[model samples]
Target: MYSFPNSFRFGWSQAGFQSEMGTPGSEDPNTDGYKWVHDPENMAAGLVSGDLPENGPGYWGNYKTFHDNAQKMGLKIARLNVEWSRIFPNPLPRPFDESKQDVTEVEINENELKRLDEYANKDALNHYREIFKDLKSRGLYFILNMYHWPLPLWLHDPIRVRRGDFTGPSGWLSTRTVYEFARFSAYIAWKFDDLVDEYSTMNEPNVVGGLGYVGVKSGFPPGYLSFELSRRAMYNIIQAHARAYDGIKSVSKKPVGIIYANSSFQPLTDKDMEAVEMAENDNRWWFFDAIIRGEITRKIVRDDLKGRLDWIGVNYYTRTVVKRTEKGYVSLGGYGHGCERNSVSLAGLPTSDFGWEFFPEGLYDVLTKYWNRYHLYMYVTENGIADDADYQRPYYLVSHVYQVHRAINSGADVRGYLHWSLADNYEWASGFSMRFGLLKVDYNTKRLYWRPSALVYREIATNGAITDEIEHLNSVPPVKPLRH
Candidate 1:
């Protein structure tokens, strides 16, 4: 009998390049097509030979079809990613030395800025206009995410570089990159001021930090392993967000924020694992503290970061079980390794296809604690299970929705819940293997098929209630916690 607030919004999220662009085969060279490759350089290498995944569902050109389907499914809000690398594929004035260290004072490329203006109006801005018009025609609202990991190849030359390699500073490590990011944010906000309202400056920078850092790491582009280097990268990202916050607000009246891939954690044993606790605290709450309280928990501090966020966007996927480990309290690696040495999985629990543990109550705990701590209006920006068989997805969707309902009832000022995606699309390093979409997509045929779970979600979306049928469909009880 759980019911959502009448004002509560529900929607689905999808990235433009990841979902819309056709894969390699279906894409024609002379036609407008997009493909997401972990290493854009390699894709570029193969482009001459025409080797890639092939045309996607044509979401890039056939967005009207996508929008109409969303309206049919009662989707009100759409969370979309505006790829920076997509817009400015070849940002000008390449790094002077791909291996130089500390290029903090590098001058902004004037020629590049002029080129960016041309690209914005000719290639990028018009596309966003088409998207906005589609949403408006369907009575839908949208949240625009500025960065989703991909950095233009020219800006981040030589892709991957090891720790402390002065010759190459890829992506966020590049000097003056923060200012460029801020400029992009301001331009997007100003240009789309009449069409779009909500803007998320960055998506899951923590995940970016972790994957781009030390000991246990993999996946995503420019993957490297160095804790200190990752910390520096995170510092740059935070500063970029702070600047973007000011930039967006200066141009538009809409609310601006950042999204974190926030995961709840639990100690695997009763052992007093201070190191584990400290790491968890730093990983989970550090960014929020810096952005909200102007309190920096990590070694680095930025006075300008205080009050940079207008709201909070949280993407909660799974809970973690931590333990004192030989490698200093690692909470298991996500680069396809199951449970490494010293750490172990939570026993007696179901797992998603991606091997994430099922902990329905974690959402409740995360939502309640965040609300109590920040006291800022928030959105469950992304939450969904990756179940290809469609067996556990129904229960997964319903259980999490029920948890959100519980949190709302307990006084969490949560405004919306956006499923991770609307359709199956490219899944980064894992490619299209791991499916996290409600609408099943046939990659080969370019067709959409509704899974049982999609209907389950549609009922709740339309009715705002977990009806009896859904209750029965989700007969699986909430996951019992592991004993300490």
Candidate 2:
């Protein structure tokens, strides 16, 4: 029944790969052609790798549709990700042989550097400037993000390194990559400083660490499996954010921050209460702890990280229950690679098409936790359910926003809320199967259909309060069965 704070703003987020128009490839210097490939997985069962079907709904060439719809819905902000690889395919210096020595060790390229600057200005930067100009013209705010896990393909390739140094098949293990990321951040900030309201240094570094480096699950690019290595990659990621924070602030007047894919968890059993605490610490708390306190579990400390964040971005979707184990912790909701057969759910909870548990209160939990700890201005950068038929999304929207209202009423200085997306786009390895958009996209026709949930969100965004109809409509089932 609580209303959102007056200062609260509503927005929608879309990543470059999912929403932007660009080929997912690296410019191969040796062949003098672009090399296109999928990030991971075998392209899925029913989908083609690196191919968008004809007449597919896209924001790349038709971003006006997105901007117009968002304005009509009364949204004031739009969260857009700048996919690093798309903008600068060859981010490394020249003599940067894709098949030869590691890019981090090569000498800097003056001519290639000039070419990259020219390429970014002429190709990638112009596209963004045009889109951002349209958004700004419509009076919409911008929350531009730097990295969203789509590193340049060359970066993911194997890099030679010494035994003592941090090196892996992925470029994240290289310290030089971290500095390069800072340089990229600086360049982006300087280019778009006037238009950017807030600049996020990285989006969901924890997810990158867990899936790509740690191999706890196999969903991200450059999938590797090593806890020690994941830890190292995560450490480097935290440092990268720290450096990017300084990098952006040095040139741009916009506020700079980082985003984490944080989830609230509960113990599956009385015996596993401590295990849930450990799981939260390892998975959720430490990620923020590293930046907020400049300490990650007291094992690694960087005093320079303190006071680096201007704000904190949270991407919350589902809360899970975990059980203690001799090996470690296992999600009751079937998060990890193994234990899918034995996955258990809360007795009477609803789930999304993707099998994510409906736990709106977790949103409140995270908001209050981060607010109390970091005391930084907060934004729900990404929050949405993967409801293919739009049946459960209306309820999910109201329920989660109610939680945000509760947290704000309880003294959480939350500044804004951005739903996961404006329209359904490519969902990485999951492809187009998982729908998380308010407006359903008919890929075959390239037409946008307004879902019932879209109306619910428009009302919320316009009024800043949940309506009585939306509350009662929670019991309404979806008209169409999930086609996921």
Candidate 3:
């Protein structure tokens, strides 16, 4: 293993929606994601995991234990979200404004801010305060991600989108969400000013847009197969990030940014080669282009959108093969076993249970590439493999950490590395089958079990270096279960 910089942060992340439910009466039932999956239509159509969000890992009720466990891991930073629905289950007094700017600059009325505060659920907000306070008590840095894919039902109704009728307001497809999200961001920034060390406006807006709008039968909410709809959602999110950046800074000096899902787009065929670069721009770079340089299109530009980034969070996973088929572009839909055929370079390579090819090289490339392009402070906000057997995790973690070391050696301003999750939780759409945690969660007993890899991770984080002894853990036989 390679030594990291002296100030490097090592940690892990978990979204509230994935883990906030589970303990009977304590479940949060307001998010669009919860409503979407629980909808009888989606369930009857077999479009969702039969397992519901209410049957998750119970992080909402187990915050202390989780953080204690995180402290046991010797974590430096921990990233999590404060859900929009939990803070405001009902609709805000303000409705959709057709002519509203995507980025709100006008001074909001004091009465309006007070009224929005009135509508917010104080119980939920204060509960998060307790959570953040406890995390800080253990000397862990807190990253309060304002949004993590689950919007309030008032903002986005997946049922409405699933149907052909879109006469009413929708989520990311609507400018209303952009404005409202800024309001929420501003509110949270002010409210949690004492506890939050940093903020990420959204987690993987690209995944939400790509999986929900473009991937065929993708298990994400309101699954559609329309490029036009995907385009709208992606555009609104970029706008939302800029708007939120301004709003958050209005209240505090804390740094603000958004997490980009990064992956290598490998061309599967010569015919597909023509589309790979374009696909990368459309799916990846266009968002960065608008926010970093304010260049929206070839001819259109906006000064407000430029330089909004205080820092950038990158979530690198695996490589994907893009191909232009007779019908349309087929890339994300080919994620599983089918990926092996299209992405020949990945054939016979090791993969996670989700069939994600282990591509550590892509992580180095992604880190260095963005470091050179944007020159912003970067974090591996989410990076981990989904392996239930605990076979690949040790190798995967150390290998990826080495790549991060490689990127740092090559002059990337990478300040931190956080794993995708802290514990196994209900993965969106896929439910709980894919486990990305260093610690295991026995959903039945509601107990946290530390895998051997978690110990391996704790060693690296606490020691501030991965040594020969750490790498040799992969060679040793696996340990028996820890929870028993």
Q: Against the hidden reference, what TM-scores do the models get? A: 0.84, 0.84, 0.91
What is the C-alpha local distance difference test score of each model?
0.68, 0.70, 0.80
| Candidate 2 deviant stretches above 4 angstroms | 22-41, 44-56, 94-121, 158-169, 297-300, 325-329, 334-346, 473-484
Q: Which stretches of candidate 3 lie over 4 Å from their true place?
A: 99-106, 109-111, 267-276, 322-346, 472-484
RMSD (CA, Å), each prediction: 5.6, 5.6, 4.1
lDDT of 3 by residue, 1-484 (tens): 5788888999988898898887755688887798887888777777777788787888888888899888988899989999999889987666556665355352444566687898899998888888889998999887889898988888888888878667755888888888888889988988898989999999989888998887747678777678999888887888888888888888889888888888867677778875677777766778888888988863578888898887889898787777887765677544423443212223445656776776677788778877887788899999987877787788778878888888999999998999977899888777888888888999987799988889989998998778878766333123232110
Candidate 2, 37-70: lDDT as tens digits: 2322334422224543222356767788888888
Candidate 3 is scored at a TM of 0.91
Error of 2 at 393 (Å): 0.8
Task: Please give the lDDT score for candidate 1.
Answer: 0.68
Pairs of residues at least 3 apart in sequence or in different chains that clash in candidate 3: none
Model 3 clashing-pair count: 0
